[PDB]
Design an enzyme around this catalytic site. Structure first.
Site, mmCIF file in Angstrom:
data_model
loop_
_atom_site.group_PDB
_atom_site.id
_atom_site.type_symbol
_atom_site.label_atom_id
_atom_site.label_comp_id
_atom_site.label_asym_id
_atom_site.label_seq_id
_atom_site.Cartn_x
_atom_site.Cartn_y
_atom_site.Cartn_z
ATOM 1 N N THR A 289 0.828 -1.197 0.000
ATOM 2 C CA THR A 289 0.000 0.000 0.000
ATOM 3 C C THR A 289 0.878 1.269 0.000
ATOM 4 O OG1 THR A 289 -1.849 -1.104 1.087
ATOM 5 C CG2 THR A 289 -1.744 1.292 1.334
ATOM 6 N N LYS B 246 -0.809 0.112 -9.801
ATOM 7 C CA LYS B 246 -1.432 0.928 -8.765
ATOM 8 C C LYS B 246 -2.938 0.966 -8.958
ATOM 9 C CE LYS B 246 2.403 4.234 -8.388
ATOM 10 N NZ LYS B 246 3.224 3.676 -7.291
ATOM 11 N N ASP C 59 10.130 14.448 -3.761
ATOM 12 C CA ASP C 59 10.057 13.485 -2.661
ATOM 13 C C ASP C 59 11.112 12.380 -2.832
ATOM 14 O OD1 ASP C 59 9.280 12.360 -0.256
ATOM 15 O OD2 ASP C 59 7.163 12.140 -0.743
HETATM 16 C C1 LIG Z 1 6.416 -10.237 1.525
HETATM 17 N N1 LIG Z 1 6.582 -9.343 0.359
HETATM 18 C C2 LIG Z 1 7.730 -9.766 -0.481
HETATM 19 C C3 LIG Z 1 7.894 -8.838 -1.705
HETATM 20 N N2 LIG Z 1 8.043 -7.410 -1.316
HETATM 21 C C4 LIG Z 1 8.079 -6.610 -2.489
HETATM 22 C C5 LIG Z 1 8.717 -7.068 -3.662
HETATM 23 C C6 LIG Z 1 8.713 -6.250 -4.789
HETATM 24 C C7 LIG Z 1 8.072 -4.999 -4.736
HETATM 25 N N3 LIG Z 1 8.083 -4.209 -5.895
HETATM 26 C C8 LIG Z 1 7.355 -3.020 -6.139
HETATM 27 C C9 LIG Z 1 6.654 -2.330 -5.154
HETATM 28 C C10 LIG Z 1 5.951 -1.132 -5.479
HETATM 29 C C11 LIG Z 1 5.177 -0.350 -4.449
HETATM 30 C C12 LIG Z 1 4.281 -1.035 -3.613
HETATM 31 C C13 LIG Z 1 3.525 -0.368 -2.657
HETATM 32 C C14 LIG Z 1 3.640 1.004 -2.492
HETATM 33 C C15 LIG Z 1 4.522 1.720 -3.307
HETATM 34 N N4 LIG Z 1 4.631 3.114 -3.181
HETATM 35 C C16 LIG Z 1 5.717 3.650 -2.345
HETATM 36 C C17 LIG Z 1 6.225 5.007 -2.826
HETATM 37 C C18 LIG Z 1 5.101 5.912 -3.288
HETATM 38 C C19 LIG Z 1 5.295 7.283 -3.208
HETATM 39 C C20 LIG Z 1 4.310 8.169 -3.632
HETATM 40 C C21 LIG Z 1 4.551 9.649 -3.485
HETATM 41 C C22 LIG Z 1 3.382 10.464 -4.051
HETATM 42 C C23 LIG Z 1 4.603 9.884 -1.975
HETATM 43 C C24 LIG Z 1 5.821 10.071 -4.119
HETATM 44 N N5 LIG Z 1 6.806 10.402 -4.612
HETATM 45 C C25 LIG Z 1 3.110 7.674 -4.140
HETATM 46 C C26 LIG Z 1 2.890 6.309 -4.230
HETATM 47 F F1 LIG Z 1 1.711 5.893 -4.739
HETATM 48 C C27 LIG Z 1 3.882 5.401 -3.782
HETATM 49 C C28 LIG Z 1 3.739 3.916 -3.869
HETATM 50 O O1 LIG Z 1 2.836 3.423 -4.545
HETATM 51 C C29 LIG Z 1 5.291 1.062 -4.294
HETATM 52 C C30 LIG Z 1 6.247 1.867 -5.166
HETATM 53 O O2 LIG Z 1 5.565 2.664 -6.133
HETATM 54 C C31 LIG Z 1 5.970 -0.693 -6.784
HETATM 55 N N6 LIG Z 1 6.667 -1.352 -7.760
HETATM 56 C C32 LIG Z 1 6.652 -0.790 -9.106
HETATM 57 C C33 LIG Z 1 7.362 -2.496 -7.477
HETATM 58 O O3 LIG Z 1 7.995 -3.090 -8.348
HETATM 59 N N7 LIG Z 1 7.484 -4.588 -3.610
HETATM 60 C C34 LIG Z 1 7.465 -5.346 -2.520
HETATM 61 C C35 LIG Z 1 6.905 -6.997 -0.446
HETATM 62 C C36 LIG Z 1 6.713 -7.925 0.771
#
Ligand SMILES: CN1CCN(c2ccc(Nc3cc(-c4cccc(N5CCc6cc(C(C)(C)C#N)cc(F)c6C5=O)c4CO)cn(C)c3=O)nc2)CC1
Length: 263
Positions: free
Chosen positions: A15, A35, A126
């Site tokens: 999230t 997203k 940011d």
């Molecule tokens: C157990 N599991 C194992 C795997 N783990 C895991 C593995 C791989 C990934 N890979 C990835 C995670 C995310 C991801 C997921 C959730 C949230 C967010 N964020 C954080 C930053 C952010 C800033 C801003 C603002 C506006 C603040 C700015 N600038 C607005 C936003 F919408 C967001 C947002 O949506 C992201 C990143 O966008 C995106 N992408 C593309 C990936 O590839 N993520 C997690 C997770 C845990």
């Protein structure tokens, strides 16, 4: 404008500021993050208007925007997928037992991406390890660049808010709302500190308020143990009290290359 039929949702990634982000396949082949924009969290029409600009922003070290889905609600933002996720968490995992070269390697990646945005005169607003991602090769890329303008949360977009990037913000931002390529440079210095301190929070012993007094008095972050004199000098250059005296990303990149060669 991607057709939603070309999307399958497979697992949850987490999230963020706009809600749930999912992993899945695009056109049954390409790994993607999707997203799902929580309704009311975004200036949706403005984002759609300006999304065409953000799609032309293409770089080896920027998380690539593949397309949007805007003829439905919630809207989708389809992006390049980063297997090892968030840089901040990645830094905090001690098992990686990073060498200082791998740390500088991570700085060169972010700087390469920021150099490109700076050329396109496009501000992130940011930049922080929480807003950078790590792919299956250990390559760091800059994420969510420019999306701050469309946030509809007053705890984030206000100076006094609980979610504002205070510890990554230069004094001119915090006191005057003076946003420029120089405030991205400041934040970049803080991000270099993050990396060399292995995910420590900047000004870990201060509140946001104590941090703002501190930097208005011309006081800065201390050298992380793992930073040499040369590496520390680089991040500190990002923190000059006169915005126009801080380096460009071009200068920073050449600075980083130098230490690589030297140390
Ligand atoms: C157990 N599991 C194992 C795997 N783990 C895991 C593995 C791989 C990934 N890979 C990835 C995670 C995310 C991801 C997921 C959730 C949230 C967010 N964020 C954080 C930053 C952010 C800033 C801003 C603002 C506006 C603040 C700015 N600038 C607005 C936003 F919408 C967001 C947002 O949506 C992201 C990143 O966008 C995106 N992408 C593309 C990936 O590839 N993520 C997690 C997770 C845990």
């Amino acid at each position: 404008e991607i057709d939603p039929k070309d999307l399958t949702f497979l697992k949850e990634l987490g999230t963020g500021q706009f809600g749930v982000v999912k992993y899945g396949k695009w056109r049954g082949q390409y790994d993607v993050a999707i997203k799902m924009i929580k309704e009311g969290s975004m200036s949706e029409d403005e984002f759609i208007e300006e999304a065409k600009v953000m799609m032309n922003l293409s770089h080896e070290k920027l998380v690539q925007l593949y397309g949007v889905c805007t003829k439905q609600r919630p809207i989708f933002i389809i992006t390049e997928y980063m297997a090892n996720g968030c840089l901040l968490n990645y830094l905090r995992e001690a098992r990686h037992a990073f060498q200082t070269q791998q740390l500088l390697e991570m700085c060169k990646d972010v700087c390469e991406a920021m150099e490109y945005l700076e050329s396109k005169q496009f501000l992130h607003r940011d930049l922080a390890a929480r807003n950078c991602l790590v792919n299956d090769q250990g390559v760091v890329k800059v994420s969510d660049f420019g999306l701050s303008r469309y946030v509809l949360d007053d705890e984030y977009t206000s100076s006094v808010g609980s979610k504002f990037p205070v510890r990554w913000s230069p004094p001119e931002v915090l006191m005057y709302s003076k946003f420029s390529s120089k405030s991205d440079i400041w934040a970049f210095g803080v991000l270099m500190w993050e990396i060399y301190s292995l995910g420590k929070m900047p000004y870990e012993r201060f509140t946001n308020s104590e941090t703002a007094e501190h930097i208005a008095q011309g006081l800065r972050l201390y050298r992380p143990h793992l930073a040499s004199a040369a590496v520390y000098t680089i991040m500190y250059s990002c923190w000059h009290e006169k915005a126009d005296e801080r380096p460009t990303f071009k200068i920073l990149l050449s600075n980083i290359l130098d230490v690589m060669d030297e140390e």
